């Protein structure tokens, strides 16, 4: 954004989506269903920017949006940036199941 005043506006939409993501905070008195319903809005807002084609001027930012949406095809296009299968697992849980339980976990592994 400092070097490239043509992408900088779109790079800041990406960066602001990277600030609206509902990550759990250990000091914070919320439910899992609150995290879940907020993350569902964030997903319904990220996919919205993919339908109006917002990132189709820089394919790197278009990939980052698919990764942040839990796209298992775009995540496997990143396999040369995932040095092991258990980092791929934790990435896939972050962007496809943030309310995962121990008794679901085997199937994802």
């Amino acid at each position: 954004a400092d070097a490239s005043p043509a992408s900088a506006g779109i790079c800041r939409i990406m960066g602001d989506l990277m600030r609206t993501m509902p990550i759990l905070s250990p000091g914070n008195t919320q439910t899992l269903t609150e995290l879940e319903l907020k993350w569902q809005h964030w997903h319904e807002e990220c996919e919205r920017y993919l339908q109006d084609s917002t990132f189709a001027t820089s394919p790197h930012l278009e990939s980052l949006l698919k990764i942040m949406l839990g796209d298992e095809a775009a995540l496997l296009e990143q396999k040369e940036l995932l040095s092991n299968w258990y980092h791929f697992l934790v990435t896939r849980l972050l962007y496809s199941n943030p309310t995962v339980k121990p008794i679901d976990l085997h199937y994802y592994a």
Binding site: E36, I103, D104
Partner: protein, 735 residues
Amino acid sequence: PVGDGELWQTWLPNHVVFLRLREGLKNQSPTEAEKPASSSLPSSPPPQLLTRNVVFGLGGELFLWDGEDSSFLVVRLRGPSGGGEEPALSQYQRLLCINPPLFEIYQVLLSPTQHHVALIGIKGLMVLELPKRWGKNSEFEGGKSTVNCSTTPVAERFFTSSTSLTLKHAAWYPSEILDPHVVLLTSDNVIRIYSLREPQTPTNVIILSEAEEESLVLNKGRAYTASLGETAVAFDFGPLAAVPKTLFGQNGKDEVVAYPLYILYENGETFLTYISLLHSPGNIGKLLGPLPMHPAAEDNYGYDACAVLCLPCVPNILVIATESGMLYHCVVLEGEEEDDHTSEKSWDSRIDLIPSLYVFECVELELALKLASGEDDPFDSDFSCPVKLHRDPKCPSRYHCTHEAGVHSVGLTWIHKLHKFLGSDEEDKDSLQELSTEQKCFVEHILCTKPLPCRQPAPIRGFWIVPDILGPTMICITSTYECLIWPLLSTVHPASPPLLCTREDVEVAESPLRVLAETPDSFEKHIRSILQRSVANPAFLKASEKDIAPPPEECLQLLSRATQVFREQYILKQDLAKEEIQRRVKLLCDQKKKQLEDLSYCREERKSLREMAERLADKYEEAKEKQEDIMNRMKKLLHSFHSELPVLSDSERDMKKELQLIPDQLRHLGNAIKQVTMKKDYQQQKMEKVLSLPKPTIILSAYQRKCIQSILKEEGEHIREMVKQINDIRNHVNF
């Protein structure tokens, strides 16, 4: 979440306990089908059918009386909280009685202390003690499949001797602070309180009949008082109250506190008594009544009164109910003090102040569904049975009614207005004017088991309201042991104002929608108002594989009643909600268009204001250069108008002395500047001649930088709140 709620609706009616009870009832039915009658006549009426509740719940488990084992069957409503395993349809505990009850049970009741259960029958009481919970699950005896429970018979020697005595009504005494006491009403018009410490002798006894001074005569007239309704039928407790100071001699000072017990007769008269188990029986326990019911009624408010319920509110609301399905809403108020004016010749100087009952409204229940018969038959027979009243454990403005043909829910919308009017100031008349606006109660037919005149009912055997584990949720169990479940609304909603959208729009500068940002629910609440139902079809119990097939004509009228209610109360309101969302979405599309046209005009004036400001700077410097040569013509003329003066003044000559002195001070200052420059040159060249070895970079750690960035945040946000608080005070203290 939300999806947690649907699983229990499909699971619980299919649990193995409801399969056991639907198999026992089959095995009971083979034996008695063949003997021909011979000529005799029983000189006796049939027994009264008492509406039942042989079910309760505690902490998250449901308790059903199995009279074929003589036990409670105990089933859990809390699934494993994480585990990936399904809740086991086969799992329960049995709580078996050590001594079995020697009578048919029509009702069960848990104690205020939650440790003891009354087992209630027409000829007795037995009380069960709950076994101690422990183990990983807080289970009875740590998870045993059968547990044996202590059981104590109460008033046994009175019921086993007096063959013409029966129970009418029973409850626990309202205390968490005493031994558990049980209260009974029996077929002699006497109330009796028993201790579980002393279960064969009453702690207190209250006679309800006026029968002093005529003694030493026997028992027979019990036929003839009952024909006049002079039988006590039911009772309930109001909240803990300070006793009226007129009921004691003028000695006391301590304010005595007791429970008001309200008592109902078969004629529909009500009486009061103040009961304490903490004070001496001096005047405490005197009967007060009959309590006058206002306004006066020309039928006399029925003569078939069967149940009573005292709501935990101020003033008290006493619900009175009949076998005809009428429910009266009596507000209880203390009586009036009479002025000494204009009266004569009353003849006892001993008027206790007796409280008055005030009917706010009455409800008429559809006990079985009314259909379209002809106009010409004066002898169709309205289907009466003993109404059973229940308190809602999460909504103090709702109560529930179970009968033989179904279940009804009732919400008193005006209770919130009554608590408003009494809690505002003593000049507030307009909260009393709100109490006059015709928001009646709402009445809700949840379950129907007699949907047609021809059909036999399925009388309720179990009723409970779950508060916390399924949300607020109702559980009903039939005469056939079928389990039926409804989630209850958490709030008694009054009706909303009439349609906030008969508006025509008017343009000056601002949006009509600003007023609708002030409340976040605004538009969704307008749709929720349009969708507000005022009739619904009740949930129907399925027909049985032993029922008679009805005439087609009853089935057509039941269908047309149902499709009319769907057309009038659902379909019409959903298309009205659709037209409202169509109107709202259009206005937002057209306002969104306007904002792009508005923005695009301001985008062109962005150019206009620049191609104006540039020329205003051009035109200013033109006027400014012109001012300076006008002034530099002026400053020359004034200089010529002083040059023609023929002699030097005293001041010209003496300014000339000072101007001749300054050059030698400038000779010293113009060496001092050079001395300070050559000082700087020497110092700077002595700083330069050190810059040939490196300083170490002070790498503040990623956590130590984050520490300073957190402290500078806390302190910068404290500074913002102080700048704010100074301006907030300055906006209030204008001088």
